[PDB]
Amino acid sequence: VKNSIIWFRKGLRLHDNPALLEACKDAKHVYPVFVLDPHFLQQKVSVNRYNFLLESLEDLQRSFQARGSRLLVLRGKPEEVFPRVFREWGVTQLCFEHDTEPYAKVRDAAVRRLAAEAGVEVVTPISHTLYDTDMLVARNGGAAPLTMQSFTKLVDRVGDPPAPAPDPPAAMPPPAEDMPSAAPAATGVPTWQEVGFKEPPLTVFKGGETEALARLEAAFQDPKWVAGFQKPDTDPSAWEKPATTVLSPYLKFGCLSARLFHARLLEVYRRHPAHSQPPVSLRGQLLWREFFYTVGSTTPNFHRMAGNPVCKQIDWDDNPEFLAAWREARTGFPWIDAIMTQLVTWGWMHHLARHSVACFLTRGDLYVSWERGMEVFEEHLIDQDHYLNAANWMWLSASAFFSQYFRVYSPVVFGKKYDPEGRFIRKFLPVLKDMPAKYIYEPWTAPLEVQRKAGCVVGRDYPAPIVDHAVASKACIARMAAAYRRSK
Numbered sequence: 001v002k003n004s005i006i007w008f009r010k011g012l013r014l015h016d017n018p019a020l021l022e023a024c025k026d027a028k029h030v031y032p033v034f035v036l037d038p039h040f041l042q043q044k045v046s047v048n049r050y051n052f053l054l055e056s057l058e059d060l061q062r063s064f065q066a067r068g069s070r071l072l073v074l075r076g077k078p079e080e081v082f083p084r085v086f087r088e089w090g091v092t093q094l095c096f097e098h099d100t101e102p103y104a105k106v107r108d109a110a111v112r113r114l115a116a117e118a119g120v121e122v123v124t125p126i127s128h129t130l131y132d133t134d135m136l137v138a139r140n141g142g143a144a145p146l147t148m149q150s151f152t153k154l155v156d157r158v159g160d161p162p163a164p165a166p167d168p169p170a171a172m173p174p175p176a177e178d179m180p181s182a183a184p185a186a187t188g189v190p191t192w193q194e195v196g197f198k199e200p201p202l203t204v205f206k207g208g209e210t211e212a213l214a215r216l217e218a219a220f221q222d223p224k225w226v227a228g229f230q231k232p233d234t235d236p237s238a239w240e241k242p243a244t245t246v247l248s249p250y251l252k253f254g255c256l257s258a259r260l261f262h263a264r265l266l267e268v269y270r271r272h273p274a275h276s277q278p279p280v281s282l283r284g285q286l287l288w289r290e291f292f293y294t295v296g297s298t299t300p301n302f303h304r305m306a307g308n309p310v311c312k313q314i315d316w317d318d319n320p321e322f323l324a325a326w327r328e329a330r331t332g333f334p335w336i337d338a339i340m341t342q343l344v345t346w347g348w349m350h351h352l353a354r355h356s357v358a359c360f361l362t363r364g365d366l367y368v369s370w371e372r373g374m375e376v377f378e379e380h381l382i383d384q385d386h387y388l389n390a391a392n393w394m395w396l397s398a399s400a401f402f403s404q405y406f407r408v409y410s411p412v413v414f415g416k417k418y419d420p421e422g423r424f425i426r427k428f429l430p431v432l433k434d435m436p437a438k439y440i441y442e443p444w445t446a447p448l449e450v451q452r453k454a455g456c457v458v459g460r461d462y463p464a465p466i467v468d469h470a471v472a473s474k475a476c477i478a479r480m481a482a483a484y485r486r487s488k
């Protein structure tokens, strides 16, 4: 008989899940498994993202329960847990969604050889990206494109991505009863308290496929907005209603299928002939994700500067004091500190807000390596993506893809063009809530009487600016021009 395991890592969803569909076909018993390391906090991960993952597992649990099955959260590492459960459960087939991350390749290749020795057939469909990214490289002559323009012409010749897979059946083959490793007390979904976190999450975005599909339908309530979407024209200061979809956490964990998103976009585009085109369109935003996945999965050392063949070797400063002030939202520039506060509280910021804080730390003002900034983003972002975080950090620091280092965002003027009254700043920096709008982006320029009346005295309640942007940005541009000349 056929007993199968569907192994969730990403792809935390029931819709468009070809690995789940294959596991369930002709199966007597199906074991939906997520493997959790109970000592992940011993040597990195904010409670905001880890609880987002836990909320995604609880949503999967309710979906399987509604279909007569159950999600098993196994504690341990995959190389030690799977050899046991293969024999105990009589497994004949192991299915999981393909993954191209570095550790994913080492981990999955080990699980492949263990299944082989146990007589278990392995099926690994592709469904986390729009396309088989290896097929895109092979169609391009054996190398990934290095520009978005060249990449978009490639996918146009390749054609549309595969349609989303059908829904799973209304009833699922359940796990066998009275299996010791499937005991409910040892396979439940933990809380953030039980895994060791002492501070509760503060983010307003809840995990799960249900929330992902709810947010998708909300975005498509106005097809005119979807059709005319232009990414560079969206408001980074909008927080009551963010200016973009905020689907990145759900796409990162696979709570939302990228192919379903793409299919829904095509349905709208065919009724709106004047819809926006790549790279600025909403479809173009998914192509950015596909582009960085295609380049990153084929480039060694993609997340580092050293050994990375696509990253410029820049002599970045080792300044812990600048990094600490940037990391702790005490730079003295309210626009920067407000966004860095949104990072630690929400775990998500608008794309152009990420631009501001990334440019400031690296090629704009402080000249600290983008790897240090990525380390800070990798801890707090609920949508942290190994390939996307790295690519955009190299972009913003002009180390890869982007080269126009004379374009420098002002930590004073940038946000003022969107939010002259500083509503975003008052929301995330309540110490400046009473400051008149004339000085909220430059609180040090406010006369002392105004600072006292507003209850925010620069130097006691809110720090002075750690740098002069005029001086600091001039020093950073001159240094980048010399680094660009020595790297020929």
Ligand SMILES: Cc1cc2nc3c(=O)[nH]c(=O)nc-3n(C[C@H](O)[C@H](O)[C@H](O)COP(=O)(O)OP(=O)(O)OC[C@H]3O[C@@H](n4cnc5c(N)ncnc54)[C@H](O)[C@@H]3O)c2cc1C
Pocket (backbone or CB within 6 Å): 231, 244, 245, 246, 247, 248, 249, 251, 252, 285, 286, 288, 289, 290, 292, 349, 350, 351, 352, 354, 355, 358, 377, 381, 383, 384, 385, 386, 388, 389, 390, 392, 393, 396
């Ligand atoms: C320094 C820096 C680091 C970043 N780190 C990440 C990261 O770790 N994870 C992440 O998902 N995005 C990252 N991005 C990209 C971008 O900031 C987010 O994807 C976007 O803000 C998410 O909001 P949204 O879901 O509303 O995007 P939308 O505009 O609604 O776009 C929809 C989807 O397209 C994809 N997408 C959009 N913009 C980009 C982009 N620039 N690159 C790649 N894919 C994109 C995402 O999957 C996103 O969910 C980073 C940007 C910067 C400048």
Ligand SMILES: [Cl-]
Pocket (backbone or CB within 6 Å): 408, 409, 410, 413, 414
């Ligand atoms: Cl600017």
